[PDB]
RNA sequence: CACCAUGUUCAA
RNA sequence: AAGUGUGGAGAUCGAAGAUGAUUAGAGACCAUUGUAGUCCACACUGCAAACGAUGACACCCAUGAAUUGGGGAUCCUUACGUAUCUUUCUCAGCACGUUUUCUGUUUUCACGCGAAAGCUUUGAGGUUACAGUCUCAGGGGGGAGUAC
């Protein structure tokens, strides 16, 4: 307590909880990640909420599976989130 | 004068259109299932004086093996619940008390 | 209110003061939580109890003392407790500071019914609980009496102006908040000096079951 | 839930009022012709007539008399 | 659907000011609703406000200073001649001493007092007092 | 031989206030006091006052009676109660350690005074 | 210079009333929950001076429960009560 | 004589509180009707009975009957008060409403329609006040209008010091119990509206019971 | 859970 | 829902009707029956206390338990806390716990409102300080939802 809410400059605790369109400026929730294939090893860029099933262009295999929210990457694959 | 919000029955405004009625337990009156007051009774078959006569003359039943009972789920008409004194008229401030379990 | 006009650190909590608060468990809140006391909570512990921020406890404690020490004729402060654990502490705070005190059933009309012969007109009311002293607060709403309260984590803060956050439940925890407030109001007046410890024992503030 | 604004909504407001004036029993009696064609005076006052017979009309409850009146 | 954005903005200011708030968040905004607020700043009924840029319509955070009683919007924007200012003052304002009727004129968006002095007329937008 | 009227009960408490030392657990001696300390005309009430007085003398042997206002047993026990040990219950609480919780200790790092001495983490 | 004048510059109204320090709400004569709270200005040695800071709160603000949030917001602004701990 | 019980009446009897606007400033309840006729001069304070009507309670064996009396009080210089008490005899309830109307005394802000040239002729802004369904609306009028009101609000507005006013009334005004107390609630709101005269910051004062706390303890 | 229908006109 | 037409069906309950009984009378309730109906197919009707006695679409709106479906984590502060138990196949699974958040049905609870009962982010609030948009109905009780 003792700090009042400023509506122009809201707290990081208050603002991280909000819905993505209920933010002060709305924005994405998703991101891109650089997924390495489990065999074959070549990197692919996979969207976090990929409803399509992305294929490895080298491996020929499918290293993603759609869900209701975030898509699930296959077992044994490595991934690190890309910036921006 | 709306005597009670929810209007006597468990149906809110935008939830159900209708609920199909059940017959009353002794009257046979068709009342909706959410309106009609519903008690699940676990009544024993024999009184404890009468059960002691039967448990003594029983090879099966004793202090170890308990005697069965009746499990019947009665549902009453609102005329039928007041008259059998299952339910009673309560004071105006006292009507909102709701019991979620058998006391 | 530990901020003076010059900028000194004279009113601030010290490692001796906060060590007393931890020993008397007057920073543990109850399991429940209200909206108005939600800003005074630091976090929740395991077993689901609320921990009160000792900064905000001390800042609202000294703020209530800067209001009581700014009362000439200290009998215009009335300190009152309907709960039984307060009544011994209410007596000893009234003894060292010199305020009116009342305990037990509040007897409605004490603040409003002017032809009663138990009719008092305090200027500042100090209630031990906002909840069990609902009747003392609700008559203060009628005759212009601001209210100081020892609030727990779920306190109804309608008509409470300076809500002190503490543990007003336990016998030791209560009375430690009245020792420490009586210890402080005497310092702001200049009766006792801030260097030496106040020799008077806290034990007389504790309620003791005379049967 | 009552009426309409709109800068170009005057035809709606003119039609809306001309139908709701017919519900006024003073406006409807002043603008229909069953008012005078069924009035025994021809939409006028003080009409002459010929006395036919004398009637005693008994008063309504709670009063009790017979009111002396003629049929003309 | 939302029809009048200015009528939306003044209704959320007036509602949050009778609740005694310190700030409002106004969504959406326009060029009209910021030119209405700058009339309310010049006669000191509101404080500093801030327009946040989306690439959408913006949002405005207005700092309230307790002075505004009621701001509202007259819908539809009735045409008001120069002879008609004393008619609009008696209808929507509480007194002739204080209170302003904001008009959109050819010269700009002004209150009623400035527009009487510059001998102009306009369509009425709203009021604040 | 039923409930005593408030005329009997209010007067009987006043006999116990003003004349506690002259009264004991017997009826027939407490009656003789109340004839000298109460100026009423009825012998029926003075029998009932000496009955309820005798009753609230047996109640004062046990403990406190509400509304009795005896003011010397209350002045004595207020002096016997206001007695404290030389070592405070807070000074004996620090001298073993205060033993705060996880969340509390995680708060006490944040303060401008730090974590106080004679503390533990439990 | 507060209250209405005459065009002769004499203060015409009786009783310029108080205003709430939280909500700028003009305190009426029958608003019997409206309180003044005097906070003692204190010196460098921790003993009170002869001057007090007085803040007055309207009656509806106490009625809702929002007075205690308002006394905090005022005394941080006046500089009476500190907003946070110093760094350890 | 009159022995006071409240601290305000002790200070009024001691002439420590000298005027009535020193009570209105600190929102103090009066609680004693001898405060008002002490502070207001005796010849400059008028009162007369608005309405007296009987109210009945059905009991076993008949009706109970008590008379509810309305009184208005105030010098015609911005002070008004209305009280409504009841009683078995009509003489008691008239006397009790006099006691009641002084306790409810309250100030009236008055202002100007156009230019400001003397004492205020009118109320400073449009104001309504509602009791029951009867809400009266009081509108500022020009300098030489007069009170344009029904004769029950007109007698109240004369005692409040308002010289020129327009008045409306929205519903069931033949109920005078709520018509009287709606003119009172509307004139009471005249110091509730924050105008740009009163935007300025005023320096805080001390309560008469704060300042004279040493004197009031000497009565004990 | 047998049966248990009704009380002229104003007025006090 | 009753009702209608043409075919099926026809167990049970059952307007009409029939017998008992109660009753002063009983054309009623109660008991025994029993036709049309109940049920299906294809047509017709469009008459509900078709209700939340509350038109639709937006806006603002305080609080604390819950619940359903989806998703995500485990001088006004520059950030942070994770348990339980079932687990050879619609199994990288299922349920739970703490916390976020969107959508829905609600509940005891701050303003405010109302003649009141009561309503209250689910408005009947934001209204004589009366204008977000559109729409339907009402104008004392009847006659009469009648006559043409
Ligand atoms: O969409 C929700 C909204 O974002 C949020 N404001 C929330 O409000 C409450 C929240 O209330 C609900 O409590 C429910 C549990 O009893 C919980 O529902 C949820 O339950 C979880 C477990 N099944 C989830 O898995 C589930 O998806 C979810 N529906 C909350 O919704 C409280 O828990 C908070 N303490 C306070 C928040 N203000 O409610 C909105 C939907 O009701
Ligand atoms: Mg239905
Ligand atoms: Mg007959
Ligand atoms: Mg029978
Ligand atoms: Mg049959």
Author numbering:
A (entry chain c): 2 to 85
B (entry chain b): 2 to 104
C (entry chain B): 1 to 211
D (entry chain P): 1 to 72
E (entry chain J): 2 to 130
F (entry chain V): 2 to 123
G (entry chain Y): 3 to 90
H (entry chain F): 44 to 263
Q: What is the paper's account of this structure, in its own sentences?
A:
Paromomycin (PAR), a natural aminoglycoside (AG) produced by Streptomyces riomosus, was recently approved for the treatment of visceral leishmaniasis (VL), a fatal form of leishmanial infection.
The nominal map resolutions for SSU and LSU were 2.7 and 2.5 Å, respectively. The high resolution of the map enabled the complete characterization of all four PAR sugar rings including the directionality of ring substituents, thus facilitating a full description of PAR interaction pattern within the Leishmania binding pocket. The overall architecture of the PAR-binding pocket observed in the cryo-EM structure resembles the previously reported site in bacterial ribosomes where PAR is tightly bound to h44 forcing the flipped-out orientation of the two evolutionary conserved adenine residues A2158 and A2159 (A1492 and A1493 in E. coli numbering). In our Leishmania ribosome structure the eS30 N-terminal region penetrates deeply into the decoding center maintaining direct contacts with the PAR-binding pocket at h44 as well as with the anticodon loop of the A-site tRNA. His5 of eS30, a highly conserved residue within the decoding center, is prone to interact via its imidazole amines with the N1 position of the flipped-out adenine residues as well as with the phosphate backbone of A-site tRNA residue A37.
